[PDB]
Amino acid sequence: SKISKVLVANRGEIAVRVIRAAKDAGLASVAVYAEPDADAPHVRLADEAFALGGQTSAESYLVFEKILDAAEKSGANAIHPGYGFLSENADFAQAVIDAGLIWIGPSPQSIRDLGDKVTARHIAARAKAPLVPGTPDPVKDADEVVAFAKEHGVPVAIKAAFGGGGRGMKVARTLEEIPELFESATREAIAAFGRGECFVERYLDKPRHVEAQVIADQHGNVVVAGTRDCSLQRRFQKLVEEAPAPFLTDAQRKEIHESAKRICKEAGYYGAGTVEYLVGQDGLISFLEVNTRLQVEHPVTEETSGIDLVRQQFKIANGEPLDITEDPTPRGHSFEFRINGEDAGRGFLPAPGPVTKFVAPTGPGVRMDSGVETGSVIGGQFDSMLAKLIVTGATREEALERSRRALAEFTVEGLATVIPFHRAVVSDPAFIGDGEKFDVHTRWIETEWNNTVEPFTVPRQTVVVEVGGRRLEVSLPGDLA
Amino acid sequence: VVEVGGRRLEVSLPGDLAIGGGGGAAAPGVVRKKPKPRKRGGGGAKAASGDAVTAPMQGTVVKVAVEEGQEVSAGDLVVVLEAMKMENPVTAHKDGTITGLAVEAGAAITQGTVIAEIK
Amino acid sequence: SKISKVLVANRGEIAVRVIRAAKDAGLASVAVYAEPDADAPHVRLADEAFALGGQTSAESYLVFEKILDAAEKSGANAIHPGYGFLSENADFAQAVIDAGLIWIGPSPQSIRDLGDKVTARHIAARAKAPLVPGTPDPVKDADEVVAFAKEHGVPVAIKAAFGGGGRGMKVARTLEEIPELFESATREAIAAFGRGECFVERYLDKPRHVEAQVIADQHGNVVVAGTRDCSLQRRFQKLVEEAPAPFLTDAQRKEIHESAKRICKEAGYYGAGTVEYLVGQDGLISFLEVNTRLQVEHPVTEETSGIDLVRQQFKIANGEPLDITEDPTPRGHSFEFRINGEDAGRGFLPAPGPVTKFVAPTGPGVRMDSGVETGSVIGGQFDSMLAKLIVTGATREEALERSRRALAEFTVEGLATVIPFHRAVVSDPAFIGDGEKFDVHTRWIETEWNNTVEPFTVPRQTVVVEVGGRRLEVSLPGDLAI
Amino acid sequence: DHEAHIKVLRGEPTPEEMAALMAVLASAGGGPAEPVKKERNMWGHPVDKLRYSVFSWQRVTLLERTHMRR
Numbered sequence A: 001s002k003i004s005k006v007l008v009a010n011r012g013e014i015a016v017r018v019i020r021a022a023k024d025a026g027l028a029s030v031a032v033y034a035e036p037d038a039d040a041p042h043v044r045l046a047d048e049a050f051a052l053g054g055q056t057s058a059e060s061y062l063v064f065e066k067i068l069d070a071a072e073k074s075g076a077n078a079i080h081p082g083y084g085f086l087s088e089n090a091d092f093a094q095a096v097i098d099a100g101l102i103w104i105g106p107s108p109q110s111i112r113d114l115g116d117k118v119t120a121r122h123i124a125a126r127a128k129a130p131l132v133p134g135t136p137d138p139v140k141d142a143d144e145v146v147a148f149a150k151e152h153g154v155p156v157a158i159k160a161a162f163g164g165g166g167r168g169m170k171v172a173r174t175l176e177e178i179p180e181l182f183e184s185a186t187r188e189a190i191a192a193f194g195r196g197e198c199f200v201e202r203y204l205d206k207p208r209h210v211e212a213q214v215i216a217d218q219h220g221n222v223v224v225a226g227t228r229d230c231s232l233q234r235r236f237q238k239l240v241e242e243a244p245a246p247f248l249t250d251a252q253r254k255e256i257h258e259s260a261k262r263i264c265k266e267a268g269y270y271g272a273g274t275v276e277y278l279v280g281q282d283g284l285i286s287f288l289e290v291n292t293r294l295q296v297e298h299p300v301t302e303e304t305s306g307i308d309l310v311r312q313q314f315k316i317a318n319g320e321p322l323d324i325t326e327d328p329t330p331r332g333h334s335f336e337f338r339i340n341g342e343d344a345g346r347g348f349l350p351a352p353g354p355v356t357k358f359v360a361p362t363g364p365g366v367r368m369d370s371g372v373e374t375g376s377v378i379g380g381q382f383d384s385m386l387a388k389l390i391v392t393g394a395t396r397e398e399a400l401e402r403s404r405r406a407l408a409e410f411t412v413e414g415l416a417t418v419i420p421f422h423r424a425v426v427s428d429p430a431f432i433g434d435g436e437k438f439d440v441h442t443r444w445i446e447t448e449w450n451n452t453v454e455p456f457t458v459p460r461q462t463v464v465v466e467v468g469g470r471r472l473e474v475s476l477p478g479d480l481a
Numbered sequence B: 001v002v003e004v005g006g007r008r009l010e011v012s013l014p015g016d017l018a019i020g021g022g023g024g025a026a027a028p029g030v031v032r033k034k035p036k037p038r039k040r041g042g043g044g045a046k047a048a049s050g051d052a053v054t055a056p057m058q059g060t061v062v063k064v065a066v067e068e069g070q071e072v073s074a075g076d077l078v079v080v081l082e083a084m085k086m087e088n089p090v091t092a093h094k095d096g097t098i099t100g101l102a103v104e105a106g107a108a109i110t111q112g113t114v115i116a117e118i119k
Numbered sequence C: 001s002k003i004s005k006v007l008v009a010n011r012g013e014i015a016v017r018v019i020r021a022a023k024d025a026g027l028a029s030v031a032v033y034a035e036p037d038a039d040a041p042h043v044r045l046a047d048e049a050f051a052l053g054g055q056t057s058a059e060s061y062l063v064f065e066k067i068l069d070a071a072e073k074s075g076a077n078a079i080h081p082g083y084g085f086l087s088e089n090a091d092f093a094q095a096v097i098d099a100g101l102i103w104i105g106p107s108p109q110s111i112r113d114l115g116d117k118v119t120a121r122h123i124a125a126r127a128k129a130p131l132v133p134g135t136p137d138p139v140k141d142a143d144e145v146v147a148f149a150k151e152h153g154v155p156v157a158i159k160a161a162f163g164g165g166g167r168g169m170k171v172a173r174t175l176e177e178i179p180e181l182f183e184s185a186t187r188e189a190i191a192a193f194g195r196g197e198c199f200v201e202r203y204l205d206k207p208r209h210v211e212a213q214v215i216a217d218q219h220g221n222v223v224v225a226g227t228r229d230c231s232l233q234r235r236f237q238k239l240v241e242e243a244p245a246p247f248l249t250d251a252q253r254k255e256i257h258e259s260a261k262r263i264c265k266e267a268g269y270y271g272a273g274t275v276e277y278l279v280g281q282d283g284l285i286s287f288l289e290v291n292t293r294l295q296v297e298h299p300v301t302e303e304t305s306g307i308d309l310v311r312q313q314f315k316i317a318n319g320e321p322l323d324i325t326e327d328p329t330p331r332g333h334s335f336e337f338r339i340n341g342e343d344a345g346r347g348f349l350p351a352p353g354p355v356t357k358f359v360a361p362t363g364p365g366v367r368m369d370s371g372v373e374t375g376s377v378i379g380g381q382f383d384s385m386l387a388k389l390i391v392t393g394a395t396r397e398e399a400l401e402r403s404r405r406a407l408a409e410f411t412v413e414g415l416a417t418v419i420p421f422h423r424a425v426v427s428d429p430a431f432i433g434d435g436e437k438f439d440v441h442t443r444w445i446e447t448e449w450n451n452t453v454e455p456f457t458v459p460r461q462t463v464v465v466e467v468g469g470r471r472l473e474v475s476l477p478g479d480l481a482i
Numbered sequence D: 001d002h003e004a005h006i007k008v009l010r011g012e013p014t015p016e017e018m019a020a021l022m023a024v025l026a027s028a029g030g031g032p033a034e035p036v037k038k039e040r041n042m043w044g045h046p047v048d049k050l051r052y053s054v055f056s057w058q059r060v061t062l063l064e065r066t067h068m069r070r
């Protein structure tokens, strides 16, 4: 009942990250790849790799049978799902537990309970978490949105109860807009998530996205490893993150650190996870969502608090009690920059293409978590992210100075990237606060940043072999002769 | 016989294998299909359309159950063939008259020998 | 730990025999073969087979690294050495044990003690075994050999303290030849056995070779599975054996049965081995050797006593106590005939050639342990033995009658064999008893048998590949059409 | 499925031995499968060099058939 071989059921940066964690822990690692990824860094880095076949996520990484088949063939005894894909699929977590593998994650019921944003709200309320004014249960029809918006005042956010990926929200600023917005919300909630359940909350005008990293034991111990700010968002998805969250009063920090412990304990949560919050422009904290997985931007917490969060996941899934028994002290400051294959000069539209050159910055304070290298190709089948650049310093000012250096060194060629945006924002007085506050907020990039970035300018052969009556499939380059 | 790391393997290679980008096959316009069993077709055309009773296997005629001119019905016994010291009944496939009984008890008989005609 | 997969570090008849034993025991079998043996029956019979490479035994079956490498690559957890080659190489037995494999054999120290004729004689003496007059110490010079010869009387044997194949013995019959034979024996033992050390023993005139099959336990139980007679020898190497040893008094049988147990207990021996003795023409028994491996002639004991001796070896190496509690009673009589590729009409000289036909006899009382089949080719790289024919009957005379039948059926064509010798001797009144004794002895064939036998009338391609952590040679026929 | 496969009739290789084997066999493959680029060119064909009697039947069964067969 201890991890000995981990199948990293994911790709790219997080696959590399977890393979590295496994090698540090001295565990064996198994990679899995779709056909476009057959030369990706994680495939060559893992101790073993298994082809899934298929050209897209729905044909490969999302197929429960293919992941569990690769686990059985490799002899992996644990599955780590990374983030995205199946990492928050409670039915996959159950399928893994039924297959007798160690699921490196929270219990399936915790995943369900928190993935339903209604049940999550009930958990938060029972935990006495700060909450936005909102409808306790899904609204039945547009007139309940009218009633809510009249009573609390517009603006109001209409949300898919099972929504995700930043798609799940529609904002109404006048009572006359509520109807059709509610219809569209139901329509695409059904189309995207298979369920129409939708609920209403007070929309916050310029909120600051703040989250607490939680480490939670199967034995009920809980630790807050730190806080992050993630309010630089292009749509409703993060581009720049930092730890610890700056410019919070000690009352706000304490409220976050205690609400996160309470809400996780009410949820029965264990593993790594994050409690996200919105800080209103008035300073009121309000609960947003528990994220039931390792966060993408965990590295800024690993750099400011000296904790390897993936190895904490291994320990928790092993069932060991936490060795950390009190919240660590944030020692420096760190930024993370997501190096998306997106053209900031062209509305941050994804732009597939070849990585003809990739030279990461190095030296003091720089960490690179790359999923790509020179000669990689970003096809459109998967998320646009290439790498995470993490820059740390003794103070936020020094980490900004180091970021201005490292982003200037960072050279990526052959496709558009958000690097020109990162270069600007790290130099922008809106983000370089006055020392007591700063002006960025969850819609600052799209509504208020002075965008000045110039727009960016033989098949495999399968041979069946029969071996004592077994079918065996051997794949060959197709040109060996 | 191949050795790989010393392991003796016996490998059967097809004569038209084309792996690694090509291989010689079928050059003069060769076709391959399921070969027909070496038996009468027995399909929509059925051999019971013939009037001859023929021996289904090589053996010895140990009993003759009919006589010349006997009227018989489908399923009636015509002869017994002993083969490998096991008795096999050979029976009329149609109604009619035993018209040319060609065998006597004790005669050695080959497969496809005409035993009689039912006409 | 328990044996699960046995690598049979041998070839031919005994390789087949141990593979068959493994399959009876339910164990997996790994064969190894030198290049001349790529088509040998054992290679196709074992569950796995590995090429050693090399054209001769010194390039292949004798290379410790090659045998242990095949054991590693196969994942065999035990090695059975058969007989010959490394089966009595104590350093190989130690290398196997250090590799962590189950050595199916006696302890390295028992091998090393009993292979030295001097230490073996000391062990026999402490065991109170019958012994020939002879010097306890090895000799230093011809002058003490002459002194021994004057004290005990000629004839005298000069024996290399390490030896084999009957070749280590020079016999002196006059006194004047002792010095020259001593020098020649020293020189030859230096060359053949690396060691000039020699010792002197009184020479028996017309001795009968008798031996006891021992099965012995790691827990110190010992059983004598039966006595065996091997007096029909040429060049001091056996040709016809039989069980039980005939025409021995109950006193002689008891003395052999008890001396064998005492010797094996004194040696701390375990496994299947034999204690060999000479019976003088006067009837006095004398200890000769302990053979620490399985005997070639085990089958006649298997047939008479009803014990599967190779499976006893597996049990012992598993460390199980003996399930046999007492010496079994022989039920019949059996003869083994070695089918050597030797021309009895030409001095039993080895003769390589094709086995263009091999029709073994069958039917009542015949067992065949063959290493060859029709289409085999016999080269000179290995011992000439093709097969062993074992014939069993309710009595010695019935077994002789059945042997005359079986040997008349036995047809081998394309190379000379000793089958005409076996046909003669099984009909020869010197080997048929008068009822209470017979006239054969360990020199009878060469000095007293009436010999009346008329004399007998592309390279593979190797590709070297790396696959992750390993280097693999792939060896293909030199003309693969593909 | 009615392709004739490679069969390992005896022996049980590990995955690495199977990979080495198949890579070697594929490198030993016969190259391009058939000379599909071969083109008809009847210039100077031997049958045109023969003397035929004016009444020779080989004008039909040899000459004409060789020109016309496709």
Ligand SMILES: Nc1ncnc2c1ncn2[C@@H]1O[C@H](COP(=O)(O)OP(=O)(O)OP(=O)(O)O)[C@@H](O)[C@H]1O
Binding pocket: A132, A157, A163, A164, A165, A166, A167, A168, A169, A201, A202, A203, A204, A205, A207, A209, A233, A235, A236, A237, A278, A288, A289, A290, A291, A442
């Ligand atoms: N009331 C609100 N006012 C402003 N922005 C909001 C409000 N509620 C949510 N948001 C924004 O919507 C997003 C909330 O997370 P969302 O559910 O859309 O995606 P996610 O974090 O990928 O999902 P999950 O947490 O379920 O994994 C963030 O961008 C947050 O800024």
Ligand SMILES: Nc1ncnc2c1ncn2[C@@H]1O[C@H](COP(=O)(O)OP(=O)(O)OP(=O)(O)O)[C@@H](O)[C@H]1O
Binding pocket: C132, C157, C163, C164, C165, C166, C167, C168, C169, C201, C202, C203, C204, C205, C207, C209, C233, C236, C276, C278, C288, C289, C291, C442
């Ligand atoms: N002292 C002796 N007197 C008479 N004949 C003897 C004597 N010693 C040996 N012989 C004959 O020589 C043969 C040699 O047999 P022995 O067991 O010594 O063979 P070996 O090949 O030298 O043995 P190993 O190598 O297993 O020690 C004996 O079988 C017997 O025929």
Ligand SMILES: [Mg+2]
Binding pocket: C276, C289, C291
């Ligand atoms: Mg001997």
